[PDB]
RNA sequence: UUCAUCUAGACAGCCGGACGGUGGCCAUGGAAGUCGGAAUCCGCUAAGGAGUGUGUAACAACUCACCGGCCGAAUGAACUA
RNA sequence: GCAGUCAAGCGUUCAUAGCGACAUUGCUUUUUGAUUCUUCGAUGUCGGCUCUUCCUAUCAUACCGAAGCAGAAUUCGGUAA
């Protein structure tokens, strides 16, 4: 649709940065990009990133950069910036956030399951402060969450408090879905970026987890 | 204990009434050859026509009037329930649209016997049938409109109760969203399962009890009754009001437990609006949870119906709690005994 | 439908519905009442500026009402502006002057009462005083052919109406009585427009001439030939200086003193 | 963290809409009277009711910004009358009489361009 | 467009190989040994590298075209039905009154004798096909095990067992005693 | 036969994501996108149109798409006989 | 009875200059100031008893299926003489 977009900002930077993102979101992602007035994050693609840079030795414009585009076959993205390395690297190691993350991953912490009337608040919060589940979400737990429930005079309840999620355990397509119903964060999203690239130096330097 | 409702069967509006269409169809259909001679095969379709006639004839226009009383029967409260549904509008539109299609059958029979004339040319008959079909169509159109309304309120009367004002009745009403889960539900066994209810937050929880050999039971309409008629440009609040107007023994409900600091000062000057209306109506005040009453609003709220200060005839009040099951039988008993020594004793 | 638009916002304040047929004309009076003529053969009065609700339905005309006129019509079109050409300093003054002008035209027996005339293809015209009453003041008959257009003078004293019958007829605006015919047109007379000075009326006709007639004298003041073809529209300026015309010939001709 | 209402006007009698969960320890009462004095100027907007309370501390933290300080900025003591009532009898009001409010409205820090709030005077104030 | 061949790479592990002759497929497995007859689709298999299967399927302009996928799914049901199996963990979620369900034995058919079913005194002797064991509740209240070694011998009878209490007037919302399938899992927990 | 899209990841089946100012105005009987009317404004982006469900008396929960990851081979809908 | 939307043909060439069928969706009760015998006071006055056979546009009984199907009662459709 838009076809071209990267070539709109070619000769306006000099210190192009590449960031590596694990669990991508939005309300916790626009807390850094919106803060700076010159750091646009590009997450989603992987081949459009080197449009104004080049992926080959005949379709590039700079030296020692085509080898970097080959390592862009993951969940990483670029960053439209031109600041100092030290003033942007330290900032990445000071931002933490806990969320639900993605399923199929051995997540820590232990969540207990209450017995009786179900709620939608949490586990550490007492039942005297919790809120009863409304009469709407019923067939979504009799097949998707495969949880044995037992209705009692209108109000839907359960039978035995069988634990299905704990520290060091992975499930399927309902691991990070049963935590969303209550409101308990699982894993903690930590900023773990990759390396970078300078036009003036024409060199690369693997940092953090990218260090081989 | 009934009136004159929930006896009328189902009524097909317009979409479920496609029968006329089917009939007109078979009609225009015909095409017979008539046995005997091939030169005298012109005599038969007259019978055809008489047939169609009788058909639409019986049709409807009499089953609609059944199930509905009169616009001026006895008490206006019997028609007040319809005001919060179809409104005197569709009301008259009740018997109104009634007589409407009603005479409709008139025009019907009319044109009917009308064509009736001739019993030659089955073809001409097809045209006649088509005309009849068109006529029928131009009717049930606007028909089914309000008729849709019809079917609606129709089924409607299955959840709405209907008491009898021609006997003893104890008006019992309470205020939800406080703690009636283990208080008001200790009398009856009403619970929301499938049947829904708008207006208020809860549904219809009418209490009932059978002491000795008497019969005391009445529903409650919270919301509209707890506010003046002028404030409600319609809705049911007014519903609450007429609801009241009905009764024999109105029982007001209070709560001095202070759930979140919801004391009464503005609704004090509201009981006088229905005070002269209670010519032969006994009153009773029941306060839930009477033990945690702090001396901060007690020396001001007591000058309402508790003590002999304002708008009080001089009745007996009760201060207890049915939630802790403390003499719940005594409270229920001492709230209808006054009616026995009033209307029953005199009449 | 007639749609009322808030000009600044381009918002639709009200959609006046209820007419069964096309709404051919609309005028908006000083009282804040909208008057319309429609193909449904009705003339309707609406409380427009206000609720946007329909107050009156007058069924009186036999055929489609194509044109209507207010006794105030000219004054309201111009607002505050008159022959002097003075424009007031502030917005308040502009409104006050416009209201003052409106009152002068509208007052009969010293009281504001806007009058309305409507014209039908039936050749019938009804003179109405809607504020005072639903009953028409009078029915004006006499035209041989259709009344295409009707106009009150700016003062609202008299009415000149253009008719197809080759005459434009004069009527007393108050009572509706028939004064006289202005013969002179050979062919159908399409429209009439009154001068700001209220002495004259200009018409444009099929005969391809414009005729300014001194209504008071009831004599033809000036005949202005020049159009090759039929003249459809005529207008007389607020300042009074020029009359404009346009029509089948496609060329505008402006006429001056 | 939790919000709760009742009837239009914290008086009534017992026909309120307060189920359970009492804010600020036990027996709120005075808690509900704290939000009544946290309306800054005069009351008006009361649509989708809100009530924010911190950990064991009933304080005020509800700033409508462009929901309550807009109607009172039209030099009109009451509220909206009928439909599309921009200002009092004008159309193009002074932009400097609203740019001072948008300056303070930046504690969220989610946007970037300052010229966004004042740019909505025809598609917001006139709608 | 009348395809000449639509070969599909069928992944078949060792130990559970099948016998290929005409249109009959053999089910080899330690957990029960059953057979299956196919005389309505006319298929043909060809061995070239044990695991994978490369054949030639003609007629591609009617309803055939890819008549291998409709068989491949049936093949997996015979492989994962003899190894992983098909345990339909159906839960009896019902209130009303404690139904006394007693399954008796008769000619090795095990007719389910339902006594007092929601006020009904009718003995519905539902026929049970061989090749599936049916137990009762042990640790979890109301649970029946439908662990079988086939699909058309377990799921086929389960559909008739569910629609055996059909009522003319009453349906499903009259009482929450309807027998629904909770989760169509397998016998093996790891697979 | 006539045509979008079609190696800077087409078109399905899944996962992940679906964000603010702002609780936008008349009706509190209920109504924080989800029975009408007045209607289709900005900023921040790889992407985010006041909107076709489920219905506790109102959110988060479930159902989903211009544009992605994975998969890597043809093609989404409307006609003519 | 009249009046729209969709527009397949025709208009030497071209869907909307002039025209425009077969459906569906409204209003209205005037077959176009009703061309010389027309919209009417007129019920075809040819059927019944007993006995045999057959069909479906299926009122009832049996077996499925609607709906705010609570129970009960009532109404409708399809497959069957």
UniProtKB/Swiss-Prot annotation, chain A:
Keywords of the record, alphabetical order, are: Cytoplasm, Nucleus, Ribosome biogenesis
Q: Which GO terms describe its cellular component?
A: cytoplasm; nucleolus; nucleoplasm; nucleus; preribosome, large subunit precursor; small-subunit processome
The UniProt entry lists the main location of this chain as nucleus
Which Cys-Cys disulphide bridges does the record give?
A: none
Q: Where is the protein found, in the record's own terms?
A: Nucleus, Nucleolus; Cytoplasm
Q: What is any Pfam family matched here? A: RL10P_insert
On the tree of life, the source organism's domain of life is Eukaryota
Task: Kindly indicate whether the keyword Nucleus belongs to this entry.
Answer: yes
Q: Which GO terms describe its biological process?
A: maturation of SSU-rRNA; nuclear-transcribed mRNA catabolic process; ribosomal large subunit assembly; ribosomal large subunit biogenesis; ribosomal large subunit export from nucleus; rRNA processing
Molecular functions per Gene Ontology:
large ribosomal subunit rRNA binding
Q: Remarks, anything else? A: Present with 18200 molecules/cell in log phase SD medium.
What family, per the record?
Belongs to the universal ribosomal protein uL10 family.
Summary of the function given for this chain in its UniProt record: Component of the ribosome assembly machinery. Nuclear paralog of the ribosomal protein P0, it binds pre-60S subunits at an early stage of assembly in the nucleolus, and is replaced by P0 in cytoplasmic pre-60S subunits and mature 80S ribosomes.
Assembly behavior: Associates with the pre-60S ribosomal particle.
**Protein name, UniProt field:** Ribosome assembly factor MRT4
From Swiss-Prot, chain C:
Residue ranges of coiled coil: none
Keywords (A to Z) from UniProt:
Nucleus, Repeat, Ribosome biogenesis, WD repeat
Main localization, broad class: nucleus
tRNA processing as a keyword of this entry, yes or no, is no
User: Where found, per UniProt?
Assistant: Nucleus, Nucleolus
Q: Quick check: keyword Nucleus in the entry?
A: yes
The record's GO CC annotations read: nucleolus
WD repeats located where? 18-56, 94-138, 142-181, 184-223, 226-257
Highest taxon, organism lineage: Eukaryota
Provide the GO biological process annotations.
protein-RNA complex remodeling; ribosomal large subunit assembly
* Oligomer status and interactors: Associates with the pre-60S ribosomal particle. Interacts (via WD repeats) with uL18 (RPL5). Interacts (via UBL domain) with MDN1 (via VWFA/MIDAS domain). Interacts (via WD repeats) with NSA2.
- Family that this chain belongs to: Belongs to the NLE1/RSA4 family.
- Tell me the function of this protein: Involved in ribosome biogenesis. Required for processing and efficient intra-nuclear transport of pre-60S ribosomal subunits. Interacts with the AAA-ATPase Midasin (MDN1/REA1), which is essential for the ATP-dependent dissociation of a group of nonribosomal factors from the pre-60S particle.
Q: What is this protein called?
A: Ribosome assembly protein 4
What organism is listed for this UniProt entry? Answer: Saccharomyces cerevisiae (strain ATCC 204508 / S288c) (Baker's yeast)
Which gene holds the coding sequence for this protein?
RSA4
Placed within the complete protein, the shown segment runs: 259 to 515 of 515
From Swiss-Prot, chain D:
UniProt keyword annotations, A-Z? Cytoplasm, Isopeptide bond, Methylation, Phosphoprotein, Ribonucleoprotein, Ribosomal protein, RNA-binding, Ubl conjugation
Give Gene Ontology CC terms: cytosol; cytosolic large ribosomal subunit
Q: Does the keyword tRNA processing apply?
A: no
Q: What else is known?
A: Present with 68500 molecules/cell in log phase SD medium.
Q: How does it assemble?
A: Component of the large ribosomal subunit (LSU). Mature yeast ribosomes consist of a small (40S) and a large (60S) subunit. The 40S small subunit contains 1 molecule of ribosomal RNA (18S rRNA) and 33 different proteins (encoded by 57 genes). The large 60S subunit contains 3 rRNA molecules (25S, 5.8S and 5S rRNA) and 46 different proteins (encoded by 81 genes).
- What is its biological role? Component of the ribosome, a large ribonucleoprotein complex responsible for the synthesis of proteins in the cell. The small ribosomal subunit (SSU) binds messenger RNAs (mRNAs) and translates the encoded message by selecting cognate aminoacyl-transfer RNA (tRNA) molecules. The large subunit (LSU) contains the ribosomal catalytic site termed the peptidyl transferase center (PTC), which catalyzes the formation of peptide bonds, thereby polymerizing the amino acids delivered by tRNAs into a polypeptide chain.
Indicate what this protein is called per its UniProt record.
Answer: Large ribosomal subunit protein uL11A
Q: Which organism is it from?
A: Saccharomyces cerevisiae (strain ATCC 204508 / S288c) (Baker's yeast)
State which stretch of the full-length protein is shown: 12 to 138 of 165
From Swiss-Prot, chain E:
UniProt xrefs under Pfam families: Ribosomal_L6 (PF00347)
Location in or out of the cell: Cytoplasm
Keyword flag Cytoplasm: yes
* SUPFAM superfamilies per record: Ribosomal protein L6
- Any one GO molecular-function label of the UniProt entry: structural constituent of ribosome
Taxonomically, which superkingdom?
Answer: Eukaryota
One GO-annotated biological process of the protein: cytoplasmic translation
Provide this UniProt record's keywords sorted from A to Z: Cytoplasm, Ribonucleoprotein, Ribosomal protein
Q: Which GO terms describe its cellular component?
A: cytosol; cytosolic large ribosomal subunit
The answer to whether UniProt assigns keyword Cytoplasm to this entry is yes
Q: What is its main location?
A: cytoplasm
What InterPro entries has UniProt attached to this entry?
Ribosomal_uL6-like, Ribosomal_uL6-like_a/b-dom_sf, Ribosomal_uL6_a/b-dom, Ribosomal_uL6_CS2
Q: Which Gene3D superfamilies match?
A: Ribosomal protein L6, alpha-beta domain (3.90.930.12)
**How is the subunit organization of this protein annotated in UniProt?**
Component of the large ribosomal subunit (LSU). Mature yeast ribosomes consist of a small (40S) and a large (60S) subunit. The 40S small subunit contains 1 molecule of ribosomal RNA (18S rRNA) and 33 different proteins (encoded by 57 genes). The large 60S subunit contains 3 rRNA molecules (25S, 5.8S and 5S rRNA) and 46 different proteins (encoded by 81 genes). uL6 lines the binding pocket for eukaryotic elongation factor 2 (eEF2).
* Miscellaneous section: Present with 52400 molecules/cell in log phase SD medium.
Q: Which family does it belong to?
A: Belongs to the universal ribosomal protein uL6 family.
What this protein is called in its record is Large ribosomal subunit protein uL6A
User: Which organism's genome codes for this protein?
Assistant: Saccharomyces cerevisiae (strain ATCC 204508 / S288c)
């Amino acid at each position: 649709r838009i076809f071209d977009e990267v070539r709109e900002a070619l000769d306006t930077y000099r210190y192009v940065w590449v960031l590596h993102l694990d669990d991508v979101r939005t309300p916790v992602l626009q807390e850094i990009r919106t803060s700076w007035a010159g750091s646009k994050l590009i997450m989603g693609k992987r081949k459009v990133l080197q449009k104004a840079l080049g992926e080959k030795r005949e379709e590039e414009y700079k030296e020692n950069l085509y080898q970097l585009s080959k390592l862009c076959s993951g969940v990483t993205g670029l960053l439209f910036t031109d600041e100092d390395v030290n003033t942007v690297k330290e900032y990445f190691k000071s931002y933490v956030r806990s969320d639900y993350s993605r399923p199929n991953t051995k997540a820590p912490l232990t969540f207990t399951i209450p017995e009786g009337i179900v709620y939608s608040r949490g586990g550490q919060i007492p039942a005297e402060e919790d809120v009863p589940m409304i009469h709407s979400l019923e067939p979504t737990m009799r097949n998707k969450f495969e949880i044995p429930t037992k209705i009692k005079a209108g109000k839907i309840t359960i039978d035995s408090p069988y634990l299905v999620c704990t520290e060091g355990e992975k499930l399927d397509v309902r691991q990070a879905l049963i935590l969303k119903q209550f409101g308990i964060a699982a894993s903690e999203f930590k900023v773990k970026v990759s390396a970078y690239y300078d036009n003036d130096s024409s060199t690369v330097e693997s940092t953090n987890i990218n260090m081989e | 204990m009934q009136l004159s409702w929930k006896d009328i069967p189902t009524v097909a509006p317009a979409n479920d009434l496609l029968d006329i269409v089917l009939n007109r169809t078979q009609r225009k259909t015909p095409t017979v050859i008539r046995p005997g001679f091939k030169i005298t095969r012109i005599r038969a379709f007259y019978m055809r026509k008489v047939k169609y006639t009788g058909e639409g004839f019986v049709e409807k226009f009499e089953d609609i009037l059944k199930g509905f009383p009169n616009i001026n029967d006895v008490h206006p409260f019997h028609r007040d329930l319809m005001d919060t549904l179809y409104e005197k509008n569709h009301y008259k539109i009740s018997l109104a649209a009634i007589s409407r299609a009603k005479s409709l059958v008139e025009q019907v029979a009319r044109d009917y016997v009308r064509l009736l004339k001739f019993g030659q040319s089955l073809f001409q008959c097809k045209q006649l049938k088509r005309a009849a079909l068109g006529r029928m169509a131009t009717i049930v159109k606007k028909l089914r409109d309000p008729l849709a309304y019809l079917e609606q309120v129709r089924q409607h009367i299955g959840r709405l109760p209907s008491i009898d004002p021609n006997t003893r009745t104890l008006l019992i009403c309470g205020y939800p969203n406080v703690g009636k889960s283990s208080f008001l539900r200790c009398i009856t066994k009403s619970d929301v399962d499938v049947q829904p209810y708008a207006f208020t937050t809860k549904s219809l929880y009418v209490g009932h009890f059978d002491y000795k050999y008497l019969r005391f039971q009445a529903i409650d309409t919270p919301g509209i009754l707890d506010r003046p008629t002028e404030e409600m440009n319609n809705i049911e609040m007014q519903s609450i009001y007429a609801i009241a107007h009905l009764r024999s023994c109105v029982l007001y409900f209070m709560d001095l437990s202070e759930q979140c600091g919801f004391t009464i000062e503005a609704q004090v000057k509201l009981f006088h609006s229905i005070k002269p209306l209670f010519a032969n109506k006994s009153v009773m005040v029941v306060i839930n949870k009477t033990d945690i009453i702090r001396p901060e609003d007690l020396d001001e709220e007591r000058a309402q119906l508790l003590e002999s200060v304002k708008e009080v005839p001089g009745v007996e009040i009760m201060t207890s709690s049915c939630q802790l099951e403390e003499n719940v039988m005594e409270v229920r008993n001492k709230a209808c005994e006054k009616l026995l020594a009033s209307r029953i004793e005199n009449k | 439908t007639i749609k009322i638009w808030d000009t600044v916002s381009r918002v639709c304040q009200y959609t006046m519905s209820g007419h069964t047929n096309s709404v051919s004309c609309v005028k908006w009076g000083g009282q804040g009442l909208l008057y319309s003529g429609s193909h449904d053969r009705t003339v309707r009065v609406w409380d427009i500026n206000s609720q946007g609700r329909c107050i009156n339905i007058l069924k009186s005309h036999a055929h489609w009402v194509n044109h209507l006129s207010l006794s105030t019509d000219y004054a309201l079109r111009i607002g505050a502006f008159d022959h002097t050409g003075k424009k007031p300093s502030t917005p308040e003054e502009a409104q006050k002057k416009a209201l003052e002008n409106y009152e002068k035209i509208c007052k009969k027996n010293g009281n504001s009462e806007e009058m309305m005339v409507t014209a039908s293809d039936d050749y019938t015209m009804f003179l109405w005083n809607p504020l005072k009453s639903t009953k028409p003041i009078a029915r004006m008959t006499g035209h041989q052919k259709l009344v295409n257009h009707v106009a009150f003078s700016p003062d609202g004293r008299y009415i000149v109406s253009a008719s197809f019958d080759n005459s434009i007829k004069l009527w007393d605006g108050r009572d509706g009585k028939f004064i006289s015919t202005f013969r002179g047109h050979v062919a159908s007379v399409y429209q009439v427009a009154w001068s700001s000075d209220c002495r004259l009326l200009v018409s444009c006709s099929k005969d391809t001439t414009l005729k300014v007639w001194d209504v008071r004298t009831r004599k033809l003041s000036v005949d202005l030939p020049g159009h090759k073809d039929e003249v459809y529209t005529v207008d007389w300026s607020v300042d009074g200086k020029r009359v404009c015309s346009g029509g089948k010939d496609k060329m505008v001709r402006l006429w001056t003193h | 963290y939790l919000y709760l209402r009742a009837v239009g006007g914290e008086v009534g009698a017992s026909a309120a809409l307060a189920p359970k969960i009492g804010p600020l320890g036990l027996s709120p009462k005075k808690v509900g009277e704290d939000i009544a004095k946290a309306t800054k100027e005069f009351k008006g907007i009361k649509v989708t009711v809100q009530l924010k309370i911190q950990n064991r501390q009933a304080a005020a933290s509800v700033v409508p910004s462009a929901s309550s300080l807009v109607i009172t900025a039209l030099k009109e003591p009451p509220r909206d009358r009928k439909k599309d009532k921009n200002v009092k009898h004008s159309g193009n009001i002074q932009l400097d009489e609203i740019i001072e409010i948008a300056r303070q409205m930046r504690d969220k820090s989610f946007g970037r361009t300052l010229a966004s709030v004042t740019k909505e005077i025809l598609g917001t104030a006139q709608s | 467009m009348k395809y000449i061949q639509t070969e599909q790479q069928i992944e078949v592990p060792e130990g559970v190989t099948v016998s290929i002759k005409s249109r009959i497929v053999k089910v080899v497995g330690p957990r029960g040994t059953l057979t299956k007859n196919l005389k309505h689709i006319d298929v043909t298999f060809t061995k070239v590298n044990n695991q994978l299967i490369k054949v030639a399927v003609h007629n591609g302009g009617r309803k055939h075209v890819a008549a291998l996928r409709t068989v491949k799914s049936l093949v997996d049901n015979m492989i994962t039905g003899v190894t992983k199996g098909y345990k339909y963990k159906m839960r009896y979620v019902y209130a009303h009154f404690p139904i006394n369900v007693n399954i008796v034995e008769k000619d090795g058919a095990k007719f389910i004798e339902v006594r007092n079913f929601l006020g009904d005194k009718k003995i519905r002797n539902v026929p049970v096909r061989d090749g599936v064991t049916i137990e009762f509740s042990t640790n979890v209240k109301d649970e029946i095990v439908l662990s079988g070694n086939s699909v058309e011998d377990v799921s086929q009878n389960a559909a008739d067992l569910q629609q055996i209490c059909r009522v003319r007037n009453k349906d499903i919302r009259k009482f929450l005693d309807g027998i629904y399938v909770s989760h169509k899992g397998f016998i093996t927990e790891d697979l």
